């Protein structure tokens, strides 16, 4: 019998894939321990088959992380702080668990978010193999490792619409948006890459037929074995939701004709102007399509939730809610399209449910995902120039209704079919999971 310890980053887009992976590995016969902060902890009662151990921010909470806001952009300061200072405690917790191990039980490996680069030297010091879960795409990584060529060209130092000389698949404007914050994030990024290369294995939330152009880069740049597993095709992340679901949406979805509803969501941490929020809204009302919008409290700047919106503005065709089981909504027959911020989990969920997309972005990997999806795979339309009520209306209608958008809708159906085929025997994802289990078992 073999145990795997998994250590996620405590944010929705990072907890979701790591607990999907944990469930996949449990289904293959491993026992599971989750090391987690108290901050943003998921509902442990949803996981009776996992053992949770809460670490790093137990009371008395430390002076370096105590006082930190639980919401907003500053909540992410916990990540560099834990990387810088958490090694001693992580080692103690791993050793305690390895000690209490049953006689017939061995800890096979530690799997961490790639962002926990500090865990490599900790695992090394215990003779414990560490594997890394990437929560972003292979294409994004390929763009990472190409930054030197980008740096020389001054792309990183603020000709927007031409293709990048290194990357034909990207525009210069994409690269400028993705790496707008290079002084600040550059340090974390380099160490994350270095310790991912130095790990014992890299698990990617993707599949070969989604990112075939990128496989050779990962083989060449990362000496450790890579595994591609499309986690949403195995199970949804419903059980790791950090917020209560509004399931009243499914009764409303059941009142809509097939493929008639635009699902709209900009993720778990994006935020917008009071100006932009009302323009998007008019863009939705203008498209004349039915829509289900998820607006996270605080998504709006200056408002607690949605106060700028006049009572009844959405009228007959629109509903706004705070939070849903997103992949389950995307699977509903009423959904015709997904207007997304292009976060990687959302993008992959939509791909796995065969839903074509309209793309916005808020930087980081998001513009790269939108570019790849829209121009390589051609499963959506990219709103790559801000929020205009007009342009929004046309993109929505092009994907949902226009005969001219039929190829985008068909591409999304075919790509979902490829995801499904990949989990079949002899499929790429099946073989990658088979390889991952036997590899972990050999450790
Ligand atoms: O109403 C919502 C909105 C989002 N999500 C989930 O939140 C995660 C968001 O991750 P993503 O990588 O798309 O973007 P982020 O929020 O990290 O920017 C995904 O798994 C979504 O399915 C959800 O369950 N309900």
Spatial separation of the C-alpha atoms in residues 145 and 24, rounded to whole Å: 29
Final resolution, Å: 1.8
* Minimum-distance ligand 1 atom for the alpha carbon of 14: 17
Number of neighbours of residue 344 by Cβ within 10 angstroms: 22
User: Are the C-beta atoms of 79 and 15 separated by less than 8 Å?
Assistant: no
Residues of the chain with CATH 3.40.50.2000: 247-422
User: Are the C-beta atoms of 178 and 363 separated by less than 8 Å?
Assistant: yes
Q: Which of 155, 154, 166, 164 is nearest to 217 (CA)?
A: 166
- 355's CB contacts (< 8 A; 6+ apart) are 263, 330, 335, 336, 337, 338, 412
- Residue 228: both structure tokens together: 């591609």
Spatial separation of the C-alpha atoms in residues 433 and 226, rounded to whole Å: 11
* Minimum-distance ligand 1 atom for the alpha carbon of 362: 18
Angle between helices 78-85 and 182-197 (to 10 degrees): 50
Please work out whether the CB of residue 83 comes within 6 Å of at least one atom of ligand 1: no
Task: Check the annotation: does 428 bind a ligand.
Answer: no
Spatial separation of the C-alpha atoms in residues 272 and 311, rounded to whole Å: 20
Spatial separation of the C-alpha atoms in residues 22 and 34, rounded to whole Å: 9
Spatial separation of the C-alpha atoms in residues 231 and 245, rounded to whole Å: 21
Task: Check the annotation: does 343 bind a ligand.
Answer: yes
Q: Which of 198, 115, 120, 186 is nearest to 156 (CA)?
A: 186
CA of 154 to the centre of ligand 1 (A): 33
Burial class, 389, CB count within 10 angstroms (exposed 0-12 / middle 13-18 / buried 19+)? middle
> Solving technique for this entry?
X-ray
User: Are the C-beta atoms of 328 and 308 separated by less than 8 Å?
Assistant: no
| SS3 per-residue string spanning the chain | CEEEEEECCCCHHHHHHHHHHHHHHHHCCCEEEEEECCCCCCCHHHCCCCEEEECCCCCCCCCCCCCCCCCCHHHHHHHHHHHHHCHHHHHHHHHHHHHCCCCCCEEEEEEEECCCCCHHHHHHHCCCCEEEEECCCHHHHHHHHCHHHHHHCCCCCCCCCCECCCCCCCEHHHHHHHCCCHHHHHHHHHHHHHHHHCCCCEEECCCCCCCHHHHHHHHHHCCCCEEECCHHHHCCCHHHCCCCCCCCHHHHHCCCCCCCEEEEECCCCCCECHHHHHHHHHHHHHHCCEEEEECCCCCECCCCCCCCCCCCCCCCCEEEECCCCHHHHHHCCCEEEEEECCCHHHHHHHHHCCCCEEECCCCCCHHHHHHHHHHHHCCEEECCCCCCHHHHHHHHHHHHCCHHHHHHHHHHHHHHHHHHHHHCCCCHHHHHHHHHHHHHHHC
CA angle 50, 429, 412 (to 5 degrees): 105
**Which long-range contacts does 184-190 make (Cβ < 8 Å, 24+ apart)?**
188/79, 188/80, 188/83, 188/115, 188/117, 189/144
For tokens 């907890």, what's the residue?
A: 15
CA of 442 to the centre of ligand 1 (A): 34
CA of 128 to the centre of ligand 1 (A): 32
Please work out whether the CB of residue 360 comes within 6 Å of at least one atom of ligand 1: no
Task: Check the annotation: does 97 bind a ligand.
Answer: no
Q: Is 71 a catalytic residue?
A: no
Spatial separation of the C-alpha atoms in residues 74 and 373, rounded to whole Å: 30
> Check: CATH 1.10.510.10 for 247-422?
no
- Residue 82: both structure tokens together: 């834990």
- 427's CB contacts (< 8 A; 6+ apart) are 421
The order of strands in the sheet holding 261-265 is 318-321, 290-294, 261-265, 335-340, 357-359, 380-382
Q: Is 14 a catalytic residue?
A: yes
Q: Which of 214, 235, 225, 136 is nearest to 434 (CA)?
A: 225
- Residue 60: both structure tokens together: 């008395």
- 276's CB contacts (< 8 A; 6+ apart) are 387
User: Are the C-beta atoms of 339 and 263 separated by less than 8 Å?
Assistant: yes
Mutation to probe ligand 1, out of 12, 230, 272 (largest number of atoms < 8 A from CB): 12
Half-sphere CA count of 439, side-chain side, radius 13 A = 17
Strand pairing of 202-204 and 130-134?
A: parallel
- 324's CB contacts (< 8 A; 6+ apart) are 245, 246, 247, 249, 292, 294
Please work out whether the CB of residue 241 comes within 6 Å of at least one atom of ligand 1: yes
Which protein residue has the closest C-alpha to ligand 1 atom 8? 13
Task: Check the annotation: does 346 bind a ligand.
Answer: yes
Please work out whether the CB of residue 33 comes within 6 Å of at least one atom of ligand 1: no
Mutation to probe ligand 1, out of 8, 9, 13, 321 (largest number of atoms < 8 A from CB): 13
Please work out whether the CB of residue 205 comes within 6 Å of at least one atom of ligand 1: no
Spatial separation of the C-alpha atoms in residues 10 and 210, rounded to whole Å: 27
Distances (CA, A) of 370 to 141, 263, 272, 344, 437: 15, 17, 19, 10, 32
Active-site position among 36, 57, 113, 142: 113
For tokens 């795997």, what's the residue?
A: 4
CA of 331 to the centre of ligand 1 (A): 15
* Minimum-distance ligand 1 atom for the alpha carbon of 327: 22
Spatial separation of the C-alpha atoms in residues 270 and 29, rounded to whole Å: 37
Burial class, 255, CB count within 10 angstroms (exposed 0-12 / middle 13-18 / buried 19+)? exposed
Q: Which of 261, 259, 265, 271 is nearest to 326 (CA)?
A: 265
What is the chain's length? 443
Q: Which of 49, 133, 53, 50 is nearest to 90 (CA)?
A: 53
User: Are the C-beta atoms of 370 and 382 separated by less than 8 Å?
Assistant: yes
- Residue 389: both structure tokens together: 């009520």
Spatial separation of the C-alpha atoms in residues 63 and 279, rounded to whole Å: 42
Torsion 400-406-411-416 (CA) sign: positive
User: Are the C-beta atoms of 250 and 332 separated by less than 8 Å?
Assistant: yes
């Amino acid at each position: 019998r073999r145990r795997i310890i998994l250590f996620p980053v405590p944010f929705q887009g990072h907890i979701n894939p790591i607990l999907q992976l944990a469930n996949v590995l449990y289904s293959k016969g491993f026992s599971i321990t989750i090391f987690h902060t108290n901050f943003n902890k998921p509902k442990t009662s949803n996981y009776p088959h996992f053992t949770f151990r809460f670490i790093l921010d137990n009371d008395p909470q430390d002076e370096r992380i105590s006082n930190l806001p639980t919401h907003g952009p500053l909540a992410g300061m916990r990540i560099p702080i834990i990387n810088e200072h958490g090694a001693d405690e992580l080692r103690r917790e791993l050793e305690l668990l390895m000690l209490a191990s049953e006689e017939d039980e061995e800890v096979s490996c530690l799997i961490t978010d790639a962002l926990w680069y500090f865990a490599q030297s900790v695992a090394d010091s215990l003779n414990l193999r560490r594997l890394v879960l990437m929560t972003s795409s292979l294409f994004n990584f390929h763009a990472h490792v190409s930054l030197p060529q980008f740096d020389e060209l001054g792309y990183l130092d603020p000709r927007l619409e031409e293709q990048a000389s290194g990357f034909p698949m990207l525009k210069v404007k994409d690269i400028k948006s993705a790496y707008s914050n290079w002084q600040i994030l550059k340090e974390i990024l380099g160490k994350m890459i270095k310790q991912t290369k130095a790990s014992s294995g890299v698990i990617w939330n993707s599949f070969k037929e989604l990112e075939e152009s990128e496989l050779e880069t990962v083989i060449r740049e990362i000496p450790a074995p890579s595994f591609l597993i499309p986690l949403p095709k195995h199970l949804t992340a419903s059980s790791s939701s950090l917020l209560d679901h509004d399931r009243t949406v499914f009764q409303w979805l059941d009142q809509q004709p097939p493929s008639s509803v635009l699902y709209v969501s900009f993720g778990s941490t994006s935020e917008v102007d009071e100006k932009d929020f009302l323009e998007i809204a008019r863009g939705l009302v203008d498209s004349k399509q039915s829509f289900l919008w998820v607006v996270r409290p605080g998504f709006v700047k200056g408002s607690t939730w949605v106060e700028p919106l006049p009572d009844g503005f959405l009228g007959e065709r629109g509903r706004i809610v705070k939070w849903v089981p997103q992949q389950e909504v995307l699977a509903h027959g009423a959904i015709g399209a997904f207007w997304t911020h292009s976060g990687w989990n959302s993008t992959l969920e939509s791909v796995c449910e065969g839903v074509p997309m309209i793309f916005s972005d808020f930087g980081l990997d998001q513009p790269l995902n939108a570019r790849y999806m829209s121009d390589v795979l051609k499963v959506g339309v990219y709103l790559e120039n801000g929020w205009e009520r007009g342009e929004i209306a046309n993109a929505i209608r092009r994907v949902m209704v226009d005969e001219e958008g039929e190829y985008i809708r068909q591409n999304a159906r075919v790509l979902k079919q490829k995801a499904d085929v990949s989990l079949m025997k002899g499929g790429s994802s099946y073989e990658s999971l088979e390889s991952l289990v036997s590899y972990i078992s050999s450790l």
